[PDB]
Design an enzyme around this catalytic site. Structure first.
Site, short mmCIF file in Angstrom:
data_model
loop_
_atom_site.label_atom_id
_atom_site.label_comp_id
_atom_site.label_asym_id
_atom_site.label_seq_id
_atom_site.Cartn_x
_atom_site.Cartn_y
_atom_site.Cartn_z
N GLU B 105 1.17 -0.87 -0.18
CA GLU B 105 -0.16 -0.04 -0.14
C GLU B 105 1.26 1.56 0.28
O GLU B 105 0.88 2.28 -0.97
CB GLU B 105 -1.01 -0.16 1.11
CG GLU B 105 -1.84 -1.25 0.86
CD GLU B 105 -2.67 -0.96 0.09
OE1 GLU B 105 -2.90 0.04 -0.99
OE2 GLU B 105 -3.45 -2.26 -0.77
N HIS B 108 2.17 1.60 -3.66
CA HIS B 108 0.87 2.10 -4.34
C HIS B 108 0.87 4.01 -3.93
O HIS B 108 0.89 4.33 -5.33
CB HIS B 108 -0.48 1.57 -4.08
CG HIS B 108 -0.05 -0.36 -4.25
ND1 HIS B 108 -0.80 -0.71 -4.39
CD2 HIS B 108 1.22 -0.93 -4.70
CE1 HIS B 108 -0.92 -2.57 -4.53
NE2 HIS B 108 0.36 -1.78 -4.87
N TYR B 112 0.98 6.58 -7.25
CA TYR B 112 0.55 7.28 -7.75
C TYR B 112 0.48 8.78 -6.81
O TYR B 112 0.58 9.63 -7.99
CB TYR B 112 -0.71 7.12 -6.88
CG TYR B 112 -1.52 5.84 -7.19
CD1 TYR B 112 -2.02 6.28 -8.72
CD2 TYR B 112 -1.96 5.19 -5.89
CE1 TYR B 112 -3.01 4.85 -8.49
CE2 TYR B 112 -2.70 3.79 -6.26
CZ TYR B 112 -3.03 3.90 -7.73
OH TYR B 112 -3.48 2.56 -8.64
N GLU B 168 -11.34 -2.94 -2.58
CA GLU B 168 -10.12 -2.23 -3.06
C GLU B 168 -10.44 -3.55 -4.38
O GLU B 168 -10.06 -3.41 -5.48
CB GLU B 168 -9.38 -3.59 -2.61
CG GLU B 168 -8.83 -3.00 -1.07
CD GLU B 168 -7.08 -4.02 -0.71
OE1 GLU B 168 -6.17 -3.95 -1.12
OE2 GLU B 168 -7.73 -4.40 0.66
N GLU B 202 -3.78 -5.66 -6.07
CA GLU B 202 -5.50 -5.65 -5.33
C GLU B 202 -6.14 -6.23 -5.69
O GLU B 202 -7.20 -7.25 -4.52
CB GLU B 202 -5.94 -4.37 -6.13
CG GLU B 202 -5.17 -2.79 -5.82
CD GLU B 202 -4.72 -2.69 -3.82
OE1 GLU B 202 -6.01 -2.45 -3.00
OE2 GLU B 202 -3.85 -2.91 -3.85
N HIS B 205 -5.19 -8.48 -2.99
CA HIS B 205 -5.48 -8.58 -1.49
C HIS B 205 -7.03 -8.72 -0.75
O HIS B 205 -7.81 -9.27 0.00
CB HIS B 205 -5.31 -6.92 -1.65
CG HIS B 205 -3.78 -6.48 -1.33
ND1 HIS B 205 -3.62 -5.17 -1.82
CD2 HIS B 205 -2.91 -7.60 -1.44
CE1 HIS B 205 -2.13 -5.30 -1.96
NE2 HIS B 205 -1.92 -6.17 -1.55
FE LIG Z 1 -4.92 -2.53 -1.90
#
Ligand SMILES: [Fe+3]
Ligand SMILES: [Fe+3]
Ligand SMILES: [Mg+2]
Ligand SMILES: [Mg+2]
EC number: 1.17.4.1
Lengths: 286, 286
Positions: B105, B108, B112, B168, B202, B205
């Site tokens: 995360e 991630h 971004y 997610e 994701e 996840h």
């Molecule tokens: Fe995630």
């Protein structure tokens, strides 16, 4: 006051917002960690067995016991990161670091357990070693001391980052030295290479603790820090000369007691304080 | 009863001891997470800007707004794992996974943010996008929904894994489709490549959520899960057709509505339940 005057510990409504970076020093510690990611699978263990069988029975004992100790302690380090440090610290940059350290502690633990599984086929012996907190008297003092600092509800973050720098820095130093000694004797490349990765990782985790310490506004007194560090040195020293003596692998106990004191000196300095033992490093290989 | 009847949630005195592995299914997903580790630095963005500049101004609005939504949501997911899932789940294998999801995360979020910093040089526009939870109405619904499940002191773990699998899985699916759309249009390899890595992570996840759910003894009812997933679909649909219309990048709002419904049916099947909408997948590129 007492917590709301601390940039590290005070409410941050942007804690889960990544950008932009404000603490660059802390951020870079995280980038260094990230850039040195490794998995247990990266370590080639396929030549270790022959070396392990060539070893004397008492060396195989020492080594298996160090592995068990490391595996158990990582879990304690992990408990503290997960339940405390990564919760209470509010700056994003520190949270990323701690998030990553948890991941790495798990890979450290896995590695140690792979080493155990590779060398020790007997599942009764495996179990004994994995349950080292309950089964090994030699780890008790160290495991109890670290768990105290998790359960201590009075102690400031400042005192507690110190204790875990003592754990990852002092409690590990004898055993690290030990494996580097084995490298000196050309034994077990897999163990010794994994040992290079992990001690580097652990040194980084202490560096980070030191960096966190600097950013504290209310630091504990030099007096109080000394108290904890000396306490940790004594325990390490008792661990290495009495509970699981380093003679078992051909090392000089006296010189090891000295090195543990040198490590603590270095950590004291890194914490912005004064040396305590004023001793040199007796090991040219550290 | 209260929760000591749950293998996942009951006291585990061995929770910080890695070995031996007992939940192999759960552990192999951790190994899969760990084998797919990547960093933001690995993604090449150099070839992206010329395409960026060719877009219609409302295409840039849309994309940067999808980017801001993502960086915001990641932090909520992150908060949840840090404060809740990784705390309350007691099986070692799952704590490793969540331990690693937290690290991923953060990567991630960074990605971004890097995308934003690369495409957008205006400092004020950067601040506006990073503060999307306070500043962007389009993300209010999705954000408040997720945050509600962190605050909810009464909902079971069983309900909350569903909620975050919805986060997610459903809250991200439209945006993911958007970026794959841009891939079809041959636009922005850096963005679309980073999008490949993140949607893979994701999916995992979500897969992991489903596996946790399957291991629960006291699951919520199909009715209760339907209610949650449906609520999620309507919020995602509003998002993609009303608040930040996918029309702005040349997609059909009617076919997107449908795609969300297809993603949810797939999630429901995976949770061990029946379909809800029974609609097929309208996008040949998912
Ligand atoms: Fe995630
Ligand atoms: Fe460590
Ligand atoms: Mg921040
Ligand atoms: Mg365990």
């Amino acid at each position: 006051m007492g917590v709301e005057d601390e940039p590290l510990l005070r409410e941050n409504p942007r804690r889960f917002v990544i950008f932009p970076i404000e603490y660059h020093d802390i951020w870079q510690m995280y980038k260094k960690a990230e850039a040195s990611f490794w998995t247990a699978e990266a370590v080639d263990l396929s030549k270790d067995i022959q070396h392990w069988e060539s070893l004397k029975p008492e060396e195989r004992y020492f080594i298996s016991h160090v592995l068990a100790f490391f595996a158990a302690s990582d879990g304690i380090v992990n408990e503290n990161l997960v339940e405390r440090f990564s919760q209470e610290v509010q700056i994003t940059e520190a949270r990323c670091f701690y998030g990553f350290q948890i991941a790495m502690e798990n890979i450290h633990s896995e590695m140690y357990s792979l080493l155990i599984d590779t060398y020790i086929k007997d599942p009764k012996e495996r179990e004994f070693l994995f349950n080292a907190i309950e089964t090994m008297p030699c780890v008790k003092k160290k495991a109890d001391w670290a768990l105290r600092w998790i359960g201590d509800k009075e102690a400031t973050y400042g005192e507690r980052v110190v204790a875990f720098a003592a754990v990852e820095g002092i409690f590990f130093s004898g055993s690290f030295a030990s494996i580097f000694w084995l490298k000196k004797r050309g034994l077990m490349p897999g163990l010794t290479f994994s040992n290079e990765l992990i001690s580097r990782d652990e040194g980084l985790h202490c560096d980070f603790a030191c960096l966190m310490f600097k950013h504290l506004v209310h630091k504990p007194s030099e007096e109080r820090v000394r108290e904890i560090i000396i306490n940790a040195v004594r325990i390490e020293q008792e661990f290495l000369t009495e509970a699981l003596p380093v003679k078992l692998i051909g090392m000089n106990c006296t010189l090891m007691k000295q090195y543990i004191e040198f490590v603590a000196d270095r950590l004291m300095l890194e914490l912005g304080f004064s040396k305590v033992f004023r001793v040199e490093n007796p090991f040219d290989f550290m």
